[PDB]
Curated annotation (Swiss-Prot), chain F:
It is found in: Cytoplasm, Cytosol; Nucleus. Plays a role in pre-mRNA splicing as a core component of the spliceosomal U1, U2, U4 and U5 small nuclear ribonucleoproteins (snRNPs), the building blocks of the spliceosome. Component of both the pre-catalytic spliceosome B complex and activated spliceosome C complexes. As a component of the minor spliceosome, involved in the splicing of U12-type introns in pre-mRNAs. As part of the U7 snRNP it is involved in histone pre-mRNA 3'-end processing. It is linked to Cerebrocostomandibular syndrome: A syndrome characterized by severe micrognathia, rib defects ranging from a few dorsal rib segments to complete absence of ossification, and intellectual disability. Belongs to the snRNP SmB/SmN family. Signal peptide: none annotated. The gene is SNRPB. The chain holds residues 6 to 91 of 240 of the full protein. Residues 1-81 form the Sm domain. It comes from the Eukaryota. Methylated by PRMT5. This is Small nuclear ribonucleoprotein-associated proteins B and B'. It comes from Homo sapiens. Changing N50S: In CCMS; expression of the protein is reduced. Disulfide bonds: none annotated.
UniProtKB/Swiss-Prot annotation, chain G:
It comes from Homo sapiens. This is Small nuclear ribonucleoprotein G. Core component of the spliceosomal U1, U2, U4 and U5 small nuclear ribonucleoproteins (snRNPs), the building blocks of the spliceosome. Most spliceosomal snRNPs contain a common set of Sm proteins, SNRPB, SNRPD1, SNRPD2, SNRPD3, SNRPE, SNRPF and SNRPG that assemble in a heptameric protein ring on the Sm site of the small nuclear RNA to form the core snRNP. Component of the U1 snRNP. The U1 snRNP is composed of the U1 snRNA and the 7 core Sm proteins SNRPB, SNRPD1, SNRPD2, SNRPD3, SNRPE, SNRPF and SNRPG, and at least three U1 snRNP-specific proteins SNRNP70/U1-70K, SNRPA/U1-A and SNRPC/U1-C. One of its GO terms (biological process) is U2-type prespliceosome assembly. CDD domains: Sm_G (cd01719). The gene is SNRPG.
UniProtKB/Swiss-Prot annotation, chain H:
It is found in: Nucleus; Chromosome. This is Probable ATP-dependent RNA helicase DDX23. Belongs to the DEAD box helicase family. DDX23/PRP28 subfamily. GO terms for molecular function: ATP binding; ATP hydrolysis activity; mRNA binding; RNA binding; RNA helicase activity. It comes from Homo sapiens (Human). One of its GO terms (biological process) is RNA splicing.
From Swiss-Prot, chain I:
Plays a role in pre-mRNA splicing as a core component of the spliceosomal U1, U2, U4 and U5 small nuclear ribonucleoproteins (snRNPs), the building blocks of the spliceosome. Component of both the pre-catalytic spliceosome B complex and activated spliceosome C complexes. As a component of the minor spliceosome, involved in the splicing of U12-type introns in pre-mRNAs. As part of the U7 snRNP it is involved in histone 3'-end processing. This is Small nuclear ribonucleoprotein E. Belongs to the snRNP Sm proteins family. Residues 5-77 form the Sm domain. Keywords: Cytoplasm, Disease variant, Hypotrichosis, mRNA processing, mRNA splicing, Nucleus, Ribonucleoprotein, RNA-binding, Spliceosome. GO terms for cellular component: catalytic step 2 spliceosome; cytosol; methylosome; nucleoplasm; nucleus; pICln-Sm protein complex; precatalytic spliceosome; small nuclear ribonucleoprotein complex. The keyword Cytoplasm applies.
Amino acid sequence: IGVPIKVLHEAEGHIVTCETNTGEVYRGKLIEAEDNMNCQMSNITVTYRDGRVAQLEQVYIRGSKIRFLILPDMLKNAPML
Amino acid sequence: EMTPEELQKREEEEFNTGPLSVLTQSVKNNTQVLINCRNNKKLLGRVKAFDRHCNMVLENVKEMWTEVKPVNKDRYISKMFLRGDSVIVVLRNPL
Amino acid sequence: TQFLPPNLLALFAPRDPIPYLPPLEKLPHEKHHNQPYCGIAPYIREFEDPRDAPPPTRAETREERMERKRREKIERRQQEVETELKMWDPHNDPNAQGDAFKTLFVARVNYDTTESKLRREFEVYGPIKRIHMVYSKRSGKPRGYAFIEYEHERDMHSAYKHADGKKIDGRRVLVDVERGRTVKGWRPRRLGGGLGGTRRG
Amino acid sequence: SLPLNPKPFLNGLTGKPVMVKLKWGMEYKGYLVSVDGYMNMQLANTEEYIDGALSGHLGEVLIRCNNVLYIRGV
Amino acid sequence: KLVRFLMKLSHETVTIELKNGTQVHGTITGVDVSMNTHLKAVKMTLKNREPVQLETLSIRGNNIRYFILPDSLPLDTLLVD
Amino acid sequence: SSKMLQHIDYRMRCILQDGRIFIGTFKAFDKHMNLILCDCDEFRKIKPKNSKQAEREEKRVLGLVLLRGENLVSMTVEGPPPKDTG
Amino acid sequence: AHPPELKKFMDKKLSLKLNGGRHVQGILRGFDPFMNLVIDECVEMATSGQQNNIGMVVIRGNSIIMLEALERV
Amino acid sequence: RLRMGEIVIATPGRLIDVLENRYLVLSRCTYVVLDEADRMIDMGFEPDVQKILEHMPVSNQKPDTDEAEPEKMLANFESGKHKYRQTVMFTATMPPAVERLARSYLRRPAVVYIGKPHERVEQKVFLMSESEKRKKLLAILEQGFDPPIIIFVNQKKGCDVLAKSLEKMGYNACTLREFALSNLKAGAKDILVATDVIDIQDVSMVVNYDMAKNIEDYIHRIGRTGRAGKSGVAITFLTKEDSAVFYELKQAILESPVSSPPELANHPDAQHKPG
Amino acid sequence: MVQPINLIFRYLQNRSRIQVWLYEQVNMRIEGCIIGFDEYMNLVLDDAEEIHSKTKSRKQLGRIMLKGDNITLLQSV
RNA sequence: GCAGGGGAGAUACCAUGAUCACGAAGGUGGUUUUCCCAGGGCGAGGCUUAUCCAUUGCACUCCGGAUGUGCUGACCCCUGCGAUUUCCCCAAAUGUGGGAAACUCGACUGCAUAAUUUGUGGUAGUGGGGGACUGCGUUCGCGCUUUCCCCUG
RNA sequence: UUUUU
């Protein structure tokens, strides 16, 4: 497990954002993140490429279609970093 | 699969017998070849070295493309290294 | 951080979300391809047949000269062996006398052992008519080989069958039959032949 | 009939003429020469066809794995 | 393999043209097995963008499309190993 | 990996595949080129379709950003690490 | 090759996004480590407002962008 | 295979993960075989076995009376799909854990006892110091053996060190998945080093350089030489740290007609029962 | 739990006319009887036909081998 | 899961005191040497910017002293590394070292690793703007479409 | 030894 993979695993359980490959951005509580950056979120707020916003009860984003992830700043206080 | 051991001598037989022989003759017979890539250009030149991933080293290559009436343009490079990912097709020069 | 108290979890608070902004690039399936990719069928003007580079212009670095030097040294050694095989004749040598069928050969012997101890060791199998040790022509050191020609071939056969592997002066010596004037096509170790496998690899 | 996997189908297509369509829209019709474990294609006396109509004749042509989309007989 | 020949191109002034039209000309200080090139004092000319000089520039192997070597490069000697 | 370790914790401006540039303190890296940027700011050039004007930069603070290496194109040294000495 | 966490979405009606700007909706009967899914009572959901039923279908994971659970897992 | 779908061979952790994630159902299950239930209790899989049995239908369980132990039992066997569930638990001994598992899962079982590796194999256990017998190992390997052979070790790491030492000694040694067993069965690997944990044929020699802490593990190691046919030779290096099993090994010295030891039988720490 | 591989095997055994859309292309699809499959999701079809959304015509090619990368979503009928 | 701990040539010198009438070549194990050279030690010299002390100076061959951050860096040394345990030997004999191994951790390298989840492309690079030059709708700002010349990547 | 490949 790499150090960004460790940071993504430690970022689960809190509210994080993730930009999709299609242009959408979903921000919500990250339930579980895997080694392949597949992230599950519960009660997330998604924003499409046009700018419209929506709410989702449960969503799952593959790591192959994930562009970037925005974590809280406390993950910068990790003992590895 | 076919070769789980540390002996990978079948790769040379596949490069000498398979499609890569069309590249491997180009290193052997020193014949010219035109390769069309994903960048809408056709590079004509000689094949000096290649690998399993079709990454080639070309010498005295000339890449020709068409910009804009479609005006053709060309550019010569004495030594270039073409990645196998951006290559779409390659065909040896008929002679 | 998952199984954490809320006092510690309050330090793990997310920041403000990013503002809404349009993407810089459009969709790849919805992009406007003004000039897509095409084949090289109009692009076939690479080279003609008579004005072509030659094939064999390729070579290794610093290995071909060493391989040619090794091949030349091997050819010189083979020529020296072929020259030495023509001048080698055990039937015309003064050191090789007597009956070859009744003469045994004792090799791998110690240099400190004299011919008298070898004669006393070889006289147990029968009477020895002649004993000839091998010495160096320039230095004078013994080469560890000797020829014992007996009066009877049965005594030489008993010495070859019984004294093979016997320890002489602390060293086990080998006993065999004479193959220089009895075996057809035999060659010594100096002529690319010989017996033994002590220095095979 | 037996369930024909693409590997014996490509083996039977070798030596026989076949048409391979790429993901970029271009196609190549010619005698299938050789194939490998990554489903690469080799062709001899092949003709390149763009947008359905024949564009020209290239000859011996190597078609890569990621660029080739489909391949069919004749 | 062909990455071993590119790994021996340290401190050589090459020109890496990317798939997005960016061309970076500079002396490659290091190359890896994943075709990533780290160069020093590079001049980058992107598509629809002005060139700029940088003291260090790292390019991934996936984004690199072509590499132009000098004409005096010993391609015969470098392909022996 | 000394060339990547020499630029550790520095203000690196990594260029993405979409043309955006994220400048931030590179906190961690991996074998798949996934980067961790601390206090990252993202900027992008907008083409002026109205008239012949200067290029517009649209920056946005993301904080702790986890960028994938598949979306990363190039990265250069933009600024020094935040020093604790006065 | 870590498998995805689609056990909560097993036999649950969810909506997934396709590669070419399309969407689908149906019961995810299983999953693959390459994110290949099996949809039961699948919906077409094209660019037009009208949709079509396909029933059982197989979706490749290379073309699946994001899946949103309509049954709340 | 789960999508493909008559019987399923599983481990308790993997079957518990499949049943907890709804990957497999037991609505049509009517037969439960528990091979090595004592080894399942020793591995800690007995709460996992209880959680796996909790997913079984209780409406198909047999009543705990005299009818489960034969005319009514054969009539229930002739019911076809309307038959009750059956349980067959195979083990090497009868601990209270496997007895409670047979009392819970099975209803009035019939006991069939065979199955004795200590009585059917020449236990050539070297009562001499295990370290001295460890040196004798090289001597036992130089004395000749029939491939494949088994090298039992208390720990996997030691087992790996013994395999590397046998590889340095000019012998093809396997470490312990299926690729090592196929090499051992085909004749490539001559000695497989492993722990006290299968898929193995009859072996001529079983070398226990590290003695197990229990007699059931020693019986399971001796059973790898073959339940019938060739008896084999089980050479066990005995030390001072295995003395709490040596009295039990005295029982292995007691009930072994195919084996001839005075060092283990007349040992002071093996003369009385431990505890 | 129904798997896509077992579903593709059942569709190949039943010889149902499967229609699969193209990857990153919403115009053309390929319909036909799935004669066989492979480990890399390559499908060999006995009677394949390419159907376009704009022209609304199906051009038949015959026994065609399609790579697994082009496959995006396959349905029945 | 698996294997590993610099390679490629000449060695003329030494050992293997080579089983045939004085020899082998060559290989192997040491020494020396040439390339791919890799990680370090020694930091002379040079660049950059601040603090303190001194200098009112007549030059046209740069150049007052000390310290700090960031760098570059020749000559000279080693063939690998950080940790454990055993035997033998030189020995300034409990220290310093040399020759061997047993093998473990620091995710060091390659591997069915170019076939759907980052390291061999469905992220192509196909533009932007100024003058004349079309048509549709119009809130007269513009959305689409049809041309030539220029500046620019 | 006893999914998490």
